[PDB]
């Protein structure tokens, strides 16, 4: 239903144990030295 100005899709490859870290409010090597999701978010992490 909704409408917005743009949708930003970012893509990475992280090993399974670290998929938890790419979320809001997580700390570790991946979310602190490599990619940091903002504290507030409206988005859907998807991993296969």
């Amino acid at each position, epitope marked *: 239903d909704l409408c917005f100005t743009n949708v930003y899709a970012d893509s990475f490859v992280i090993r399974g*144990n670290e998929v938890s870290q790419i979320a809001p409010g997580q*700390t*570790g090597n991946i979310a*602190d*030295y490599n990619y940091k999701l903002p504290d507030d978010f409206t988005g859907c992490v998807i991993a296969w």
Partner: antibody, heavy 117, light 107 residues
Framework: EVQLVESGGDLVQPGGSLRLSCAAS????????MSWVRQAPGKGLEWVSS???????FYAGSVKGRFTISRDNSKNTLYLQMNSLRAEDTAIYYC???????????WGQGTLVTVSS | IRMTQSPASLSASIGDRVTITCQAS??????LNWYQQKPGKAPRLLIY???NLETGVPSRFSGSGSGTDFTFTISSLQPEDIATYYC?????????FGQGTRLEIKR
């Protein structure tokens, strides 16, 4: 030489607050991974806390909210503020620098904490 | 991880071939370090990653493993080798050590 005189602590009543201090020879504390192991007398070493190169703090289950870790840029001296102690925390505490994957280590001689009544 | 070391009293004569086995409860891949703690003196790091012995060590200690079960070997048992060896995994946040295998010498 990476030699550590991590020497602080001797003992307090149950419910006290002790302050450890570590120290540093070739490196700077705030740039390398460091952690604090805990060796009870006659028992396998157990892991209490760990700091990262950007300030991330991780604790153990038994020390959630009683223990604190803190890193001091000015004089090395990785600080570990023991608070809300008890009568089963008696163990030898070793300061430890762990470079994560490339492999070197410092475990300093370590200090004794016997906290009792 | 429920780290498991199977030999705790193992006693070999001068110059023998022994082996220590540290076992885990999940796949830790290759991130398991082998330590050596002499009596009183602070532990030393002997084999980081489970497959790399640190430089400056004598060249007898070798270790190899992957996934759950790991093994530690001693090639020449010099008399000045009495200590307690520990296996540590350093990438799962609840870092759990092993029990130690107190090694002694027989004569």
């Amino acid at each position: 030489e990476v030699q550590l005189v991590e020497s602080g602590g001797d003992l307090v009543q149950p419910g006290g607050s002790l302050r450890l201090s570590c120290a540093a020879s070739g490196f700077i504390v705030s740039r390398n991974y460091m952690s604090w192991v805990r060796q009870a007398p006659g028992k396998g070493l157990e892991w209490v806390s760990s700091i990262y190169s950007g300030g991330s703090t991780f604790y153990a289950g038994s020390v959630k909210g009683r223990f604190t870790i803190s890193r001091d840029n000015s004089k090395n001296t990785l600080y570990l503020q023991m608070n809300s102690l008890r009568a089963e925390d008696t163990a030898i505490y070793y300061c430890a620098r762990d470079i994560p994957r490339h492999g070197g280590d410092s475990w300093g001689q370590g200090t004794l904490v016997t906290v009792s009544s | 991880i429920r780290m498991t070391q199977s030999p705790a009293s193992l006693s070999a004569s001068i110059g023998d071939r022994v082996t220590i086995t540290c076992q885990a409860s999940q796949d830790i891949n290759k991130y398991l370090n082998w330590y050596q703690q002499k009596p009183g003196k602070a532990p030393r790091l002997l084999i980081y990653d489970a497959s790399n012995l640190e430089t400056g060590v004598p060249s007898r200690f070798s270790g190899s493993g992957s996934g759950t079960d790991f093994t530690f070997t001693i090639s020449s048992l010099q008399p000045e080798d009495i200590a307690t060896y520990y296996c540590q995994q350093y990438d799962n946040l609840p870092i759990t050590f092993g029990q130690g295998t107190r090694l002694e010498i027989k004569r």
